[PDB]
Design a protein around this nucleic acid. Structure first.
Lengths: 217, 131, 101, 46, 343
RNA sequence: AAGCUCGUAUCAGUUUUAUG
RNA sequence: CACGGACCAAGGAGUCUAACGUCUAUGCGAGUGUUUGGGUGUAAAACCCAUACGCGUAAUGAACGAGGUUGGGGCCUCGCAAGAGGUGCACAAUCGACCGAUCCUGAGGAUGGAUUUGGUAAGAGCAUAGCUGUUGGGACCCGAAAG
């Protein structure tokens, strides 16, 4: 099992597990399984990242792990005029598993390892909004992706999800968006509904009002 | 005049420092109340039954308000229609934990509540009967 | 966790603790930088640690990270300081990038 | 490759800068208020 | 789940196998509970000691009473032997009955709740998985390949002591073994002549699922102790009410620990018992306090040390400098010489 | 000594005033 | 004023136990108490409990309805603040009801009147450990005519 190998203490085996998984990810006609397999794979990747601490190499591991999101059926099929090509669904499931694993293990990260996971989240969010279509210029797929994103991270209605991840997402949203290099489908600014709707964490509402909206961009 | 707790538990001491830090750096009365209650002895911290929590939930806007119990939550066999709510307490009995989880609710610790409500956002404090 | 370990070593008979007449607690651990058993000074209670040691005349920069907490055998990653005060200090500063003051 | 600053450190720096701007504004306001109050006290004493 | 622990062969080379955490090491660590349980358990191996009842009362004596200009303490009768006229029947008298003679029915054993004992044992076992905590216990675990240490099941089958000690040395336990046999010192005090002459530091602990000769093989080597997963004695686990003993586990023992101490999947392997639940989800407070959520809704801090203000009082009416700070009209008064104003 | 309700209008080895 | 003190080395006195309690901490919690014993054992050491047993869990039908108002540590809205509004644990007053019954009555004891009764309305106890109070045991130590 990849998850068992990805969490292996030995560094060589851990790296080889990811190297082999680079192909298992693109192994077609096998990602149709339920989201539980994606959740298990991302749980294994969580420990795989956990086993790296040094700044320079951990950044390399984080970026190569974030590239896994784009590894899924790179934008070479030219699936224009298709609501779902059966490949973007795999990417959506992968992102959902990533967010579920990160949300569940948010408080299991020590103080020193928190920066590593913040960097990993930043890299994953960069790979997202970079690989939906060729880039984030697809309404028919952004509506599905935003629906599967709006319902978990920015919900702010269920206190089960910690408010730190939404705060980091708010902080890095505009920073990462400018990296893509415009009139992009930015329905994303969800935050208006969060501010309008009560019952949410007042800290989150204040942070988004003071920082996100106040931004000149 | 209560300043510090007599309990030797390390986890209780960590919770006490967290609550003191929140109270001193937030000036929110909710944190002060819980910090003061943490120093109360076992007798002064009677358990709060799950039936008592369900009865307290009958007030308006209970779904949007979480319930916080300084003491320990004990199961009750006289009630079965337990609503879905988040309960935070130092300890949860096996029966009470099963009842809360079975009814779709979630049980969390004091630190989880503090991170979810640094200033007591929609937090309800229940005190068990003294005698 | 570090906090649990920190409490377990503050009280509860930490192995290396010297009760000086002045009341100061001195730590005899070789890896300690100050030699005192206090917070952010005891390597055992700190996941991240940095210290300077030397077997021969060469001086090394011993550092610890949470990565090797599961492998006590090779916890520390010593790096030679290329003995020279100015360049050694520059190398120490470069190595301890973004570390605590 | 270049080592990037910690995200927590970046947030701390941003918060420090934002608080320092307000601190400087408050210092300027306090200086102006002190000058005005000194003038008021001088006239009151006279 | 939680990370997995690899298995090291007798040669010391890591094996291409790993096992899931039994979840026992994730139990809360409560030094107070362990210390309280140990203080009562150590008293179990106590033998009753008392003074002879006939002591003191054997002597025959009577009180002379007033009129003799002497202490009214009872004195021995007779004569010629010298003992006559000597005081007796009193703790203040030589050879007399001691005040409050010790009696055999003193409370020796202490009853301890079974759940408290289980909690203490679980905490002691969990403390063994922390290298820093084990190091603070004084064990030389600085050169162990991994913690907790798990060895292949073939270790339990070793019969000769030489092979067992060689295997222990090969897995980084040589330092711990050498720690013993070097601290051997004569007993300090009156215990040298009460079958307590020699004392030594505790050695490594070896845990096995089943015994095939390892217990006899390691019996002779000083310091080293052997125990079964079922028992897991608290006294051996945490000698002197101290957490974090160096324990060398085995693959079979590691696998059987899940059953013995229970987990989320296996219910308890015991009658109506479950592992204790933490009252706090996170055992670390630095991450929580420094969390984004808390920091976002926290007022700005100070300088970490209050600046001294008005350390010394500057008395006006002198030192014009301070006088000009207050009453800014002082400059006008002095310049205009208003004090000597003329009608 | 512990608990709850709390900071007030709870009071005074004081004075005047008012009712007498 | 009275009783001790010629000087010095050692000894010398709120110590143990059974019962009933307050406070404190732990484990569980409407359940709790492994150790009278058996299994087991590196052997008075360490680990587990099939049935019993001590305590509590239900008053003098508890849903008339597991109760309505006034306050109430707290929470939310408005408000720069002052303050205003909505909701409120424990706990207090009030409105009251009830389990069983008084004080009478009078279809053998139903029905109807007059007062109130001690408490429920939605458990808090078990065992362990520390200072500590009372009683009996030589009882903080010696000494009182004696059968």
């Amino acid at each position: 099992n990849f998850v068992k190998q990805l969490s292996s203490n030995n560094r060589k085996t851990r790296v080889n597990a990811l190297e082999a998984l680079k192909k298992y990810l693109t192994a077609k006609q096998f990602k149709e399984n339920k989201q539980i397999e994606f959740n298990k794979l991302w749980k294994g990747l969580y420990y795989a990242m956990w086993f790296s601490d040094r700044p320079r190499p951990q950044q390399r591991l984080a970026n190569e792990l974030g590239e896994l999101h784009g590894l899924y059926f790179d934008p070479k099929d030219n699936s224009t005029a298709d609501e779902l090509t059966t490949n973007d669904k795999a990417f959506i499931k992968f992102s959902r598993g990533f967010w579920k694993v990160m949300c569940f293990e948010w408080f299991n990260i020590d103080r020193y390892r928190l920066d590593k996971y913040l960097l990993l989240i930043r890299r994953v969010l960069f790979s997202q909004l970079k690989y939906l279509q060729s880039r984030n210029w697809d309404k028919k797929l952004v509506d599905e992706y935003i629906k599967k994103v709006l319902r978990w991270l920015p919900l702010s209605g269920s206190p089960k999800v910690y408010t730190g991840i939404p705060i980091h997402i708010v902080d890095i949203l505009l920073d990462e968006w400018e990296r893509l290099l415009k009139k992009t489908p930015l329905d994303v600014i969800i935050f208006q509904d969060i501010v309008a709707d009560y019952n949410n964490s007042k800290v989150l509402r204040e942070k988004i009002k003071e920082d996100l909206f106040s931004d000149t961009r | 005049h209560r300043t510090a707790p007599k309990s030797d538990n390390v986890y209780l001491k960590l919770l006490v420092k967290l609550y003191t830090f929140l109270a001193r750096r937030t000036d929110a009365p909710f944190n002060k109340v819980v910090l003061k209650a943490l120093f109360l002895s076992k007798i002064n911290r009677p358990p709060v039954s799950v039936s008592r929590i369900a009865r307290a939930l009958k007030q308006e806007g209970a779904a949007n308000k979480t319930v916080v119990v300084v003491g320990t939550v004990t199961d009750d066999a006289r009630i079965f229609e337990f609503p879905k709510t988040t309960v935070a307490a130092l300890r949860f009995t096996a029966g009470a934990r099963a009842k809360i989880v079975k009814a779709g609710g979630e049980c969390i610790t004091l630190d989880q509540l503090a991170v979810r409500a640094p200033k007591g956002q929609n937090t309800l404090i229940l005190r068990g009967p003294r005698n | 966790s570090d906090e649990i370990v920190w409490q377990v070593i503050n009280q509860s008979f930490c192995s290396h603790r010297i009760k000086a007449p002045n009341g100061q607690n001195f730590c005899r651990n070789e890896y300690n930088v100050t030699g005192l058993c206090t917070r952010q000074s005891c390597p055992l209670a700190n996941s991240k640690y940095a210290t300077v040691k030397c077997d021969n005349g060469k001086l090394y920069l011993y550092m610890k990270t949470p990565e090797r907490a599961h492998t006590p055998a090779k916890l520390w990653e010593r790096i030679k300081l290329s003995k020279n005060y100015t360049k050694a200090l520059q190398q120490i500063d470069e190595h301890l990038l973004h570390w605590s003051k | 490759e270049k080592i990037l600053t910690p995200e927590s450190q970046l947030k701390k720096s941003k918060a420090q800068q934002k608080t320092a701007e307000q601190v400087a504004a408050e210092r300027a306001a306090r200086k102006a208020a002190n000058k005005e109050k000194r003038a008021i006290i001088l006239e009151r004493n006279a | 789940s939680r990370p997995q622990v690899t298995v090291h062969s007798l040669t010391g080379e890591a094996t291409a196998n790993a096992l899931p955490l039994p979840a026992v090491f994730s139990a809360p660590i409560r030094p107070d509970i362990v210390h309280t349980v140990f203080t009562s358990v150590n008293k179990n191996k106590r033998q009753a000691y008392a003074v002879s009842e006939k002591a003191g009362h054997q002597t025959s004596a009577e009180s002379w009473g007033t009129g003799r200009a002497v202490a009214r303490i009872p004195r021995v009768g007779g004569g010629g032997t010298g003992r006559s006229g000597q005081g007796a029947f009193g703790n203040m008298c030589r050879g007399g009955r001691m005040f409050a003679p010790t009696k055999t029915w003193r409370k020796w054993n202490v009853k301890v709740n079974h759940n408290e004992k289980r909690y203490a044992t679980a905490s002691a076992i969990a403390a063994t998985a922390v290298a820093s905590l084990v190091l603070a216990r004084g064990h030389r675990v600085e050169k162990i390949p991994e913690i907790p240490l798990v060895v292949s099941t073939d270790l339990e089958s070793i019969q000769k002591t030489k092979e067992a000690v060689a295997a222990l040395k090969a897995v980084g336990a040589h330092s711990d073994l050498l720690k013993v046999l070097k601290s051997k010192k004569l007993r300090a005090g009156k215990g040298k002549y009460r079958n307590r002459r020699w004392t030594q530091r505790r050695g490594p602990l070896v845990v096995y699922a089943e015994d095939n000769g390892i217990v006899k093989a390691l019996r002779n080597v000083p310091g080293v102790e052997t125990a079964n997963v079922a028992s897991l004695n608290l006294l051996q686990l945490a000698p002197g009410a101290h957490l974090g003993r160096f324990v060398i586990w085995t693959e079979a023992a590691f696998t059987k620990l899940d059953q013995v101490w229970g987990s989320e999947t296996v219910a308890s392997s015991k009658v109506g018992y479950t592992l204790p639940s933490h009252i706090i989800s996170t055992s670390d407070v630095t991450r929580i306090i420094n969390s984004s959520e808390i920091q976002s809704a926290i007022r700005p801090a100070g300088q970490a040390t209050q600046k001294r203000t008005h350390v010394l009082k500057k008395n006006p009416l002198k030192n014009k400098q301070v006088l000009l700070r207050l009453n800014p009209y002082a400059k006008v008064f002095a310049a205009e010489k208003l004090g000597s104003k003329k009608a």
